[PDB]
Design an enzyme around this catalytic site. Structure first.
Site: not given
Ligand code: GSH
Ligand code: GSH
Lengths: 209, 209
Positions: A9
């Site tokens: 990620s």
């Molecule tokens: N804008 C956030 C993005 C974080 C994000 O959307 N992470 C994803 C993985 S890359 C995630 O946790 N997806 C799972 C979910 O939201 O349930 C950051 O910069 O930390």
């Protein structure tokens, strides 16, 4: 502190590179299986109700948003403020670049690639054009500049390295963006967390295979 | 300093509300006609190569990204740090909420409404669901909390007021999100820049007529 993350990620990798730059160790590192919906457990939601990664848990303080975590690490654990100087104008430029990374550059990545890799939808021309618009801006930001947000390497360079390396491993050709290409090769050399980031990029690359 | 803006624009309104909260006056306020592509003039690009609004020009220092501008104003011109305290954990929580406002909440606004109002495309169900997901998170953030990012009114409340008031004027029904509704009515009363923000919302509303 405990970091909840995935090696592939990009927002997690920006946090990992920041910790490395600062000589910060996470006492626990936990890989969250999002396929198995591990972020939806009652225990995880109690820490982060938005159920995202990366999430930092630091003695009862929970924090998410990668770029918020990056600033928190520098401010709390940094031996100096080199990556995020106290100077109001220097900080403001870095902040603008961090919002650009989230809202323009990495946004163009996810909006073009995620529907293909996760929903098997066809490549979208308008979404690709938005990537190009974002790289053009970054290329302009870097005109006559060694670093992306001031005279010194900063958190903005770490954030952009996480994003641009994701484009790189995805096979997006950015050779023609001369300033971006130059900045990228140079920044890699200055980043002690680069190996780990690129290794994570290789893990992310599995989504394309 | 000179502010380049539009009264209808949510990110501009967040900056305007912040200036009002701080007792900051802009010596020049310039409305940019984006239809007439005024942001593409050589003079504008020299200040902000990303050609966006809001843009602040402060004695040769140029800055854009609304939420970067908001923090810059508090840090440089604030008589106190109440809206963005020096405390590292307090700042981190506000920063996370600011990234949430950009990347989740206001993103859901633009992705649902912009294609309809500007490209005359039909309302998209998946994009509407993303608005609801974003309000659910905000509603959860506000459970048992008077303010959105700590024990005191902060920049996060200003940012969310700009966004939620845009949803309001667009006709998005959020009554069922009880904590959001409660927070919203209370925050309006505490915001000296509210009239001006709501007046700008009325200008934005013309896109629907
Ligand atoms: N804008 C956030 C993005 C974080 C994000 O959307 N992470 C994803 C993985 S890359 C995630 O946790 N997806 C799972 C979910 O939201 O349930 C950051 O910069 O930390
Ligand atoms: N994330 C930016 C959004 C700024 C933005 O996209 N502004 C729009 C108007 S609401 C704009 O300048 N559009 C004209 C253009 O990009 O050429 C912020 O928070 O300031």
């Amino acid at each position: 502190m405990d970091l909840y993350y995935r090696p592939g990620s990009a927002p997690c990798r920006s946090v990992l590179m920041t910790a490395k730059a600062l000589g910060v160790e996470f006492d626990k590192k936990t890989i969250i299986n999002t396929r198995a919906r591990e972020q939806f457990t009652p225990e995880y939601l109690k820490i982060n109700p938005q159920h995202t990664i990366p999430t930092l848990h630091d003695h009862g303080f929970a924090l998410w948003e990668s770029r918020a975590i990056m600033v928190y690490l520098v401010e709390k654990y940094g031996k100096d403020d080199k990556l995020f100087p106290k100077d109001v104008q220097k900080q403001a430029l870095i902040n603008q670049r961090l919002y650009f990374d989230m809202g323009t550059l990495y946004k163009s990545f996810s909006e073009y690639y995620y529907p293909q890799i996760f929903l098997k939808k066809p490549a979208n021309e308008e979404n690709y054009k938005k990537i190009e618009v974002a790289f053009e801006f970054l290329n302009t930001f870097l005109e006559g500049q060694t670093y992306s947000a001031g005279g010194d390497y900063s958190l903005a360079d770490i954030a952009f390295l996480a994003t641009v390396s994701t484009f790189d491993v995805a096979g997006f050709d950015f050779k023609r963006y001369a300033n971006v290409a130059r900045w990228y090769e140079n920044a890699k050399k200055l980043t002690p967390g680069w190996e780990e980031n690129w290794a994570g990029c290789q893990e992310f690359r599995k989504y394309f295979d």
